[PDB]
Design a protein around this ligand. Structure first.
Ligand code: HEM
Ligand SMILES: CCCCCCCCCCCCCCCC(=O)N[C@@H](CCSC)C(=O)O
Length: 458
């Protein structure tokens, strides 16, 4: 009953490692999955993992009694700067559950209602920037989505203004973050990471980590010097006590959580918004539907929290963009004990699995055969989608803690974008997906023609 697992091409003693010697590893793995199927083994010197792409096997991988979150080599490298923050901690480390309990309240509905005004502050800056462009100009989409998302997590979470719209170059934190993520991605295929040919990479990596930490220093210092009372994410990080242990986070872990939330709290949302706008311009009828909803629902100068919740179709458009291009494209698991996967693949305690989310989301046995079409209507009734078929936010207790924050922000902004402008894919842009562990279109530009609808203050 046991089956021999397919495996891609090898390179002698380097096994499959050289297949990751590309600037687009996830896309390369997706192609391999298309060739090999629902599961394939991937070996590197001294290690092995198994890539899953079907809902039938992934539903098993998501059974928390059998599998727990694993730190992929990618996350082990990110941990060099994110430490035991929530994204890069093992479930069994004391600081995971402790920080989880202390920070969960920062993402409650009450908390979301409280972040709304600040999300509008940054959204208005984005709309004003576009309203102020001259006729001969265009929009660099992912660049501006990154300005928006970093500023939103900075303001809502830390009462800190990155003021990204006041810069024509990326904010310094972004430059160093991108370089650090790129280095972790690039280090995946190094068979000999310690060879002196990598000393410059190591030196630059440390410099980038320093830039991120100097920023964290300013955020912590600005909060101390604040005379105003805040009750945001940072307030809970600094003062919250875990109800289980009764203990608050220590300084070292707090610094890791700030770095973690500044990165996880914006990068993937900037990817989502970029991919959603890309699909909208490539599917005119869908853009028309979304724009009609935005005009019909957003009747006030600025959106209210309830109005954003009423943007159902915009929400569907965002979920369909997450289906095709989940911006944190994979997550890893390890077998808690010996177990047999899908009744054919025996695994030993400790064996690892990688869930290739874009492939899961293209499982024709779940969705129809039309998996490559952008059809928001697939999500008219999210509750009807089979369990574990759609997982852009991970799984179980280790799922995304900021899912509702991301979706609220993206729905708000995309709704405002669609209410205020008509968009044009003026260059007939060819999708080019840049990988920095996370995924984001590169070089995507559009032209926006204002509908000249006044924007309320605030
Ligand atoms: C559409 C945008 C987003 C996507 C696609 C996304 C996706 C994910 C995924 C797939 C995981 C699980 C990773 C794994 O198992 O290795 C995760 C974890 C996490 N995300 Fe998000 N995320 C998004 C936005 C956000 C935002 C806006 C925040 C902060 C406000 C955030 C904070 C976190 C944290 C802290 C974790 C780790 C949770 C834990 O294990 O306790 N995410 N996210
Ligand atoms: C604290 C903030 C953290 C932000 C990090 C966000 C990460 C999102 C994850 C993207 C997934 C990375 C996928 C990388 C490709 C891959 O399959 N790597 C595998 C290769 C195994 S063979 C040596 C791995 O990393 O183990």
């Amino acid at each position: 009953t046991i089956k021999e697992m397919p495996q891609p091409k090898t390179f002698g003693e380097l096994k499959n490692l050289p297949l990751l010697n590309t600037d687009k590893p996830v896309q390369a793995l997706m192609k391999i999955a298309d060739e090999l199927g629902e599961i394939f083994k991937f070996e590197a010197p001294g290690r092995v993992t198994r890539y899953l792409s079907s809902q039938r096997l992934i539903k098993e991988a998501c059974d928390e009694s059998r599998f727990d979150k694993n730190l992929s080599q990618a996350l082990k490298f990110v941990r060099d700067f994110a430490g035991d923050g929530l994204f890069t901690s093992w479930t069994h480390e004391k600081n995971w559950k402790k920080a989880h309990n202390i920070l969960l309240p920062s993402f409650s509905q009450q908390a979301m209602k409280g972040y709304h005004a600040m999300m509008v502050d940054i959204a208005v800056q984005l709309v004003q920037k576009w309203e102020r462009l001259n006729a001969d100009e265009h929009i660099e989409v992912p660049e501006d989505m990154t300005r928006l998302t970093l500023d939103t997590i900075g303001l809502c979470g830390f009462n800190y203004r990155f003021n990204s719209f006041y810069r024509d170059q990326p904010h310094p934190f972004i430059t160093s973050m991108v370089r650090a993520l790129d280095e972790a991605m690039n280090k995946l295929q190094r068979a000999n990471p310690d060879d002196p040919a990598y000393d410059e990479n190591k030196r630059q990596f440390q410099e980038d980590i320093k830039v991120m930490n100097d920023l964290v220093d300013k955020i912590i210092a600005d909060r101390k010097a604040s005379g105003e009372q805040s009750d945001d994410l940072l307030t809970h990080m600094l003062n919250g006590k875990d109800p289980e242990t009764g203990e608050p986070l220590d300084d070292e872990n707090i610094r890791y959580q700030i770095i973690t939330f500044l990165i996880a709290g914006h990068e993937t949302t900037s990817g989502l918004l970029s991919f959603a706008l890309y699909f909208l311009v490539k599917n005119p009828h869908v853009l028309q539907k979304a724009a009609e909803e935005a005009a019909r629902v957003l009747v006030d100068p600025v959106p209210s929290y309830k109005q954003v919740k009423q943007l159902k179709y915009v929400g569907m458009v965002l979920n369909e963009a997450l289906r095709l291009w989940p911006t944190a494209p994979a997550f890893s698991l390890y077998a808690k004990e010996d177990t047999v996967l899908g009744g054919e693949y025996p695994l030993e305690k400790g064996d690892e699995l990688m869930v290739l989310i874009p492939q899961l989301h293209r499982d024709k046995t779940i969705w129809g055969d039309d998996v490559e079409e952008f059809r928001p209507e697939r999500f008219e009734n999210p509750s009807a989608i089979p369990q574990h078929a759609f997982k852009p936010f991970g799984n179980g207790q280790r799922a995304c803690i900021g899912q509702q924050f991301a979706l609220h922000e993206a729905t708000l902004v995309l709704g405002m974008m669609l209410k205020h402008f008509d968009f044009e894919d003026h260059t007939n842009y060819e999708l080019d997906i840049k990988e920095t562990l996370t995924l984001k279109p590169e070089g995507f530009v559009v032209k926006a023609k204002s509908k000249k609808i006044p924007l309320g203050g605030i």
